[PDB]
Symmetry: C2
Subunit: 128 residues, 2 copies
């Protein structure tokens, strides 16, 4: 609906969509992170980070060397715009960020940071 | 088959099984690693590593820290009783090993070492 998305993350390492379209009719955009499945955090754990595709891998790498204890995300990451916290199945989590934080025509991509989940748990965030 | 498992590494981190048996009536065993799935090595690579349940941790670990140009295994890993290579989309590779390396009543474990894969990609080797 209006200024929020209902995004999923399953047991298959599948986000529900690779497409997030953020209208300019906004100042705040919310991400409704959900996880159907029956797998715990330490197994099929998901998250949601935002950043320039340029920096993506920076997040990923750093995220990786920071453990589950740091939500597979370096403490205070200047590349991380928005970001949720890791979540297991039947769990939930939201994040809000300022639409003004996203500069016109730049590469925006979303993705889980849990080791080797990056790959196919990715997306493009388009500022409409 | 006899001696013999063909295991399956698909795309959604699911090795076909969770248990492999190695009858005592063998000096040597042989494992068939297929790879159903359109996804490249670097993306969703698979292997087959064998060790006590005791070293697993150390092996998933050191492995991870070693890179796709080292099939996420640590050169000459003494903990590793036998391993295949890391296979891309549809690729194939086998391992053949001396069953006499195995001591009954020990907990043996098989698994992939690709970053956050052993989560789901692990199982049981039973010297029957
Ligand atoms: Cu994930
Ligand atoms: Cu694997």
């Amino acid at each position: 609906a209006e200024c929020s998305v209902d995004i999923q993350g399953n047991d298959q390492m599948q986000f529900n969509t690779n497409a997030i379209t953020v209208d300019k009719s906004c100042k705040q955009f919310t991400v409704n992170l959900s996880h159907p499945g029956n797998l715990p955090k330490n197994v099929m754990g998901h998250n949601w980070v935002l950043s320039t595709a340029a920096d993506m891998q920076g997040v990923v790498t750093d995220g990786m060397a920071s453990g589950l204890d740091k939500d597979y995300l370096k403490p205070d990451d200047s590349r991380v715009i928005a970001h949720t916290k890791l979540i297991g199945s039947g769990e939930k989590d939201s994040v809000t960020f300022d639409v003004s934080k996203l500069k016109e025509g730049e590469q925006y991509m979303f993705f889980c940071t849990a080791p080797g989940h990056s790959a196919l748990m990715k997306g493009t965030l388009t500022l409409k």
